[PDB]
Amino acid sequence: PVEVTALYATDGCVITSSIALLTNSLLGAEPVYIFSYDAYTHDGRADGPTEQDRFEESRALYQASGGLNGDSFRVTFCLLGTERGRTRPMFVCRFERADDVAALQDALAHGTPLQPDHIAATLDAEATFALHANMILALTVAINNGQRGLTTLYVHHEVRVLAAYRRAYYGSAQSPFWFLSKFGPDEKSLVLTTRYYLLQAQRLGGAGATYDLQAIKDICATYAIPHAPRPDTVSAASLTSFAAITRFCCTSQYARGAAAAGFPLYVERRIAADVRETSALEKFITHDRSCLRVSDREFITYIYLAHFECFSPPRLATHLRAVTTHDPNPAASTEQPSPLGREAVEQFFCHVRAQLNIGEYVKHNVTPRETV
Amino acid sequence: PVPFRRLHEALGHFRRGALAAVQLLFPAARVDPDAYPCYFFKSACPVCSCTDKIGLRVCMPVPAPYVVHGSLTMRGVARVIQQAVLLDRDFVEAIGSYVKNFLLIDTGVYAHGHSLRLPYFAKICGRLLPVFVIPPACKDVPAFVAAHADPRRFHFHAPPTSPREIRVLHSLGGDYVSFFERKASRNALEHFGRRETLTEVLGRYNVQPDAGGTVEGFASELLGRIVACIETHFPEHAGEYQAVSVRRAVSKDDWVLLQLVPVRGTLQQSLSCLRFKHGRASRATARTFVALSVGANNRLCVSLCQQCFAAKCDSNRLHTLFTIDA
Amino acid sequence: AFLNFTSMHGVQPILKRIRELSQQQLDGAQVPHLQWFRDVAALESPAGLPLREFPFAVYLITGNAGSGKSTCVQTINEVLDCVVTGATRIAAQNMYAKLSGAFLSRPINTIFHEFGFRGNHVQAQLGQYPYTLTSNPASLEDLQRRDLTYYWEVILDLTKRALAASRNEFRALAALERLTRLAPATHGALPAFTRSNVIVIDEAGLLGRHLLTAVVYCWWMINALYHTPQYAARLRPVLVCVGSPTQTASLESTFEHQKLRCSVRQSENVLTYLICNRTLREYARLSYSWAIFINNKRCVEHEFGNLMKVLEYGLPITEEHMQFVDRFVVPENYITNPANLPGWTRLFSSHKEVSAYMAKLHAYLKVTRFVVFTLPVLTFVSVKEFDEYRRLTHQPGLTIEKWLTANASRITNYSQSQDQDAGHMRCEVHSKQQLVVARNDVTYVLNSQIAVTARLRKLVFGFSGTFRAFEAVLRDDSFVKTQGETSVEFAYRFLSRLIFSGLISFYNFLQRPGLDATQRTLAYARMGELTAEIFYCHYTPGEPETTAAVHTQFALLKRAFLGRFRILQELFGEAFEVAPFSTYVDNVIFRGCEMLTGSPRGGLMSVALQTDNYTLMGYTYARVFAFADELATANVAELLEEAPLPYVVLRDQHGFMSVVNTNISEFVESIDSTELAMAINADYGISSKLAMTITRSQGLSLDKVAICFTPGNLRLNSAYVAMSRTTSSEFLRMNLNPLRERHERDDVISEHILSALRDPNVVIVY
DNA sequence: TTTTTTTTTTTTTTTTTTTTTTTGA
Ligand SMILES: Cc1nc(N(C)C(=O)Cc2ccc(-c3ccccn3)cc2)sc1S(N)(=O)=O
Ligand SMILES: [Zn+2]
């Protein structure tokens, strides 16, 4: 019952090929290429999951040797689209037979495309055509002014069907080069960030659901797990079609084990540590700003000085080096407490007492010359 | 416009804060903040019909045995009082919803030669008249009222009202020493770099300003370049600075201004203003200066500047025309 | 990598506020009904118009210009439902560039397109009817009625066009069981305001206050006729206005039809309207809905930053600031002389000054001997137009040249129209098609970084670069990305054609001095070896209309050239890479400025972008039917067939040559409420980017700047805008010192930002 | 000597396809 969320992109127009796949028509159906996937199982405990419980469950899920660990697989294929959801499902397939799971492990651990037969014989018609049934109804109503209905609407007005399936799932297939462009040049980014920002962010919830692609790529950059060399020495920029990106991601070692299990937890950890320090610093910032009562020039000097003294490039570099990990296991993490807020408070926010009805600012430069 | 009762309560709070500040500044005095007389005067603008400002003057006896000496010392006393009255929550709670700018005290009326309008006097629009804020434990009310009419209570250098000891507070804090300013300046050096002072930069071009006429040493050779610039870009007055002598006039530690008065032709022949072409006599009513400063990546920047006596240009204001490298 | 950190973690509170601002349901009675917009159509004059509140929300994103305020917009787009818009086409394209550089953003249009602004609205009497506000305190209803009376000649037309269009749309789907979420997808070409309630207006300070209400008003319109699911959910618009409040201003132009005196007064922009109006600052609750971005990223100086701080925040001007800006002053005759500061953009505070400066440099370059070439620009007035309009102006006596005394600015894009050196108008009656036509000459410079002003249709004829630059294009397929993902086959056909046409270039490089006999011998030997696994020979080009064809036939040609480039790259080292490779689909000979692209076939038809920095090349004629989409307009179409219309050729940043179309613009303004097509102006619409006005400089940032300041007219806001267009203070020269001269400073919005920086509920992002 | 009068933005609907060269007085 292991559930997989999969992002795919065929050779050409993925929308037309996918619709033809749904209609069981042998006219246009390029073999399916799966290049990012998130596997999960429904948690049987009410509030049992902990961070290490989740890490153990995930490390069990992503088989270190390759592939997954379940017997039956419900895979929900998706495209880059919006309903704000970053992806959109297209079709759902069951994999219970030995041949079905053999094809899924092969296509999930190596990257060999899934032929139309394997999918077409395994559409969950009880739910697949149910996902887009409302789109069928809306198309019927619009053109007036399940699978037989889909075929009939395919025949009647092709232009409007294609336009509707391209407006929804708006991104669809952009380009092979686009993915290598917008999801980092590194293999770590290309696998892990594509998994998280698309198929893992909104499902797992948390703060990372509201973070942008550049932020998530930065978090991945500081997720500096050990890097083993690539057995084929294939460079990340030597990729032209999706048969290369898929092969790079599936036979990567940031995809089927500890790193694939630690990244979602590390996103949450980094954000928590960062917000702990930033929110403290902004509490101080807002309070001192509100009660400063100084001249306009000196006010600007304080606001810029304080934002520098807390968020300067050196302080920021030390902080990001304090949250960088060297291992995905949360109980074996090498991240250590960040010095940002304590250092900022120690030097600049220690003089708040001077402006607290003390007159300590005078005491700093008093020189009381009273000659007797 | 404000109600008088709110103003009087705010003035009581001001008395409290100022007396705390005074007992802090003069530590060996005895200022009981319920009997020490502060005197208040308001400018005529009941309903305070104030559309511009509530003109106030606050007079405090300097507590015995102290006497304050120096313009800067009273400047510091004023800063302490000003930053002490905006600490008492009562004052800010009372008058805060009314004051657009929280700055109340002006500290520039204490320089030598600067005048302050006395109470019981008007302006040529408002005769400063007393507003009585009786001390909370004043043991002589009639004396306090008939203390605002004695000129000694509102005169800077009045006779102090059998002195054994006397303590003269003649120096307090300095200027531009704010912690924000001193921290920001230090961070600038760490992050951006050191901008060498004018003297150090001039020292590279064999100029030691300790001796007299040394800056004129470089101003000499600089005059040729400046004249070459003007007789190319500003030619309609070309033959005017052929023979001039740099006269050192203003010396700030980052701004050396040398006047360029001539002798040739006529001793008092004024230098025609380079811009805003005027008549024969109006144009020849201007002065010229050379300004050495430090600029860019620590390179001595030389500027030609003018001071015109005509209405078209800002009268008696210094203007710049070109800045050349050296 | 640490640069983004502050924005990354400070935009989240912004995101966690816009969400509740957009998910706040209104009471049933407060929702503007359809009958409201029905009555608005019935109303003739904007006087009996009933006082009607149109609910809305705002969230203000202020910050220095180029403070990277776009990171906030970027995060908003990928997380929230939103319709991103722009106050100017340039700003909209700038946001598109900065939103597609991270993820997918749908084509970003202007807010004017979003609320339905069309051609005839451009010259419309937008300031006619009066209003005595029953106010102080000004009710929001009165402010909205003022902004609707201001734009009566636009609001009324939009309402009438939307209403009288008829009802199906969402009304249909909503009754699926009596699915409107899937309605904008199935029913296409629907207005983008029907699918979101968060409207991001970037550089909103370029819009006047009249627009704010207008946008909200229009929002409700487009959600009432269509009965959008948001209208059923009782949601209200939230206007995320992003812009610089102290580096941007909005101006209103009114033309008096007897004095012929076009006047331009200053106006209250949306940002200033929201910040400084006590009614809007309370209803919109700007205190809990304001984000100030405070960092100037591009800037890498220290004293330059302090000066920007004092100018933007209204801080007192001290002696030290005067001495700092003293190091920039260079004489009046030094800036204006074209021999000085080559490549530095020069700003003036008058359009006449720019018209003078552009002409002198033209003479300089011409006498000294780029090429100062002459190119025709025409105009087309009609007899009936200037007959009836002269009749209606209460003065039937007015000469045509006196008609073109000032309406030349009001006949096309003002910016280049009043900032161009041109000849004498030859107004000759060409009434063959019942017309009177004019003829002048807008001398340009040859091979300069010019910018496209209006919307032009670029037709790429080939690439004039290096072998390495063309290898790069093919390797990353960057060109294909510029054409959009939906139509990639058209981009792949033309590259295929180029590679099968640019094979002769290799053979010319064969004639290069300093090469061994056997060096060239190995060159042709490896050419033969590659032909063995492939000499031009007789390759069969072309492909059917199939997706596979452009990924198989092109794939061979792409791999063919790629290999071939890299093959001779190793053979001749860096020499071959730097060798100039020009590929065209036709015999293109360019003697002097005149070019000749022979007979076009429209291999790749696209649209030029205004932001794209093009380079002037030459005026080939080569009449293309692609630009000749001419259908009044036909009466001048016949004359355009008669007189060969020159198509000016531009070179983009990559180096691809593109031939463009001309531009045509109408003048329609009148006083008798009779908007009729008077005159259409055919010209080129290109700008030099070498000299401009301070007011237009607000829009776009510049590399090197020399400012010419007119004394007396000194406004410190103009000084701040002029000095802030460049990143580095090193490359900045000025006429005089704006800090040392008398300057009219208007520090009213400055104190308002300062009080905003002094409020606990305002979010400051560093 | 008075003496001026400065600056801006928006205006769409698509991607291929019939060639002509003596005229005047
Ligand atoms: C010297 C030191 N280093 C710190 N940095 C890096 C800065 O200010 C950096 C900055 C901050 C604001 C701006 C800006 C730009 C346009 C308008 C207003 N402002 C520019 C640059 S802060 C200063 S300090 N401690 O003197 O205030
Ligand atoms: Zn003068």
Coordinates of N, CA and C and ligand atoms in Angstrom, one line a residue, chain A residues 304-305 308, chain B residues 184 187-188 192, chain C residues 64 294-296 302 305 308-309, ligand 1:
Chain A
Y304 N 19.6 51.1 10.4 CA 20.6 50.5 9.5 C 21.7 49.8 10.3
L305 N 22.2 50.4 11.4 CA 23.3 49.9 12.2 C 22.8 48.5 12.8
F308 N 22.5 45.8 10.2 CA 23.8 45.3 9.9 C 24.4 44.4 11.0
Chain B
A184 N 28.5 52.7 14.1 CA 28.4 52.7 12.7 C 29.7 53.1 12.0
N187 N 32.0 50.0 12.2 CA 31.6 49.0 11.3 C 31.9 49.4 9.8
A188 N 31.9 50.7 9.5 CA 32.3 51.2 8.2 C 33.7 50.8 7.9
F192 N 34.1 48.4 4.8 CA 34.3 49.1 3.6 C 35.7 49.6 3.4
Chain C
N64 N 13.6 51.0 -1.2 CA 14.4 51.7 -2.2 C 14.2 51.1 -3.6
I294 N 14.4 47.8 3.0 CA 15.3 48.9 3.3 C 16.8 48.7 2.6
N295 N 17.1 47.7 1.9 CA 18.6 47.5 1.5 C 18.8 47.9 0.0
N296 N 19.8 48.6 -0.3 CA 20.2 49.0 -1.7 C 21.2 48.0 -2.2
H302 N 29.9 53.5 0.2 CA 29.6 53.8 1.6 C 29.0 55.3 1.6
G305 N 25.8 55.6 -0.3 CA 24.7 55.1 0.4 C 24.2 56.1 1.5
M308 N 22.2 58.7 -0.3 CA 20.9 58.1 -0.7 C 19.9 58.1 0.5
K309 N 20.5 57.7 1.7 CA 19.7 57.7 2.9 C 19.2 59.1 3.2
Ligands
LIG1 C1 29.3 51.2 7.0 C2 28.4 50.3 7.6 N1 28.3 49.0 6.9 C3 26.6 48.8 6.7 N2 26.1 48.6 5.5 C4 26.5 47.5 4.7 C5 25.1 49.5 4.8 O1 24.7 50.4 5.4 C6 24.6 49.1 3.4 C7 23.5 50.0 2.9 C8 22.4 50.3 3.6 C9 21.4 51.1 3.0 C10 21.6 51.6 1.7 C11 20.6 52.6 1.1 C12 20.4 52.7 -0.2 C13 19.5 53.6 -0.7 C14 18.8 54.4 0.1 C15 19.1 54.3 1.5 N3 19.9 53.4 1.9 C16 22.7 51.3 1.0 C17 23.7 50.5 1.6 S1 26.0 49.9 7.8 C18 26.9 51.0 7.7 S2 26.7 52.0 9.3 N4 27.1 50.9 10.5 O2 27.7 53.3 9.2 O3 25.2 52.5 9.5

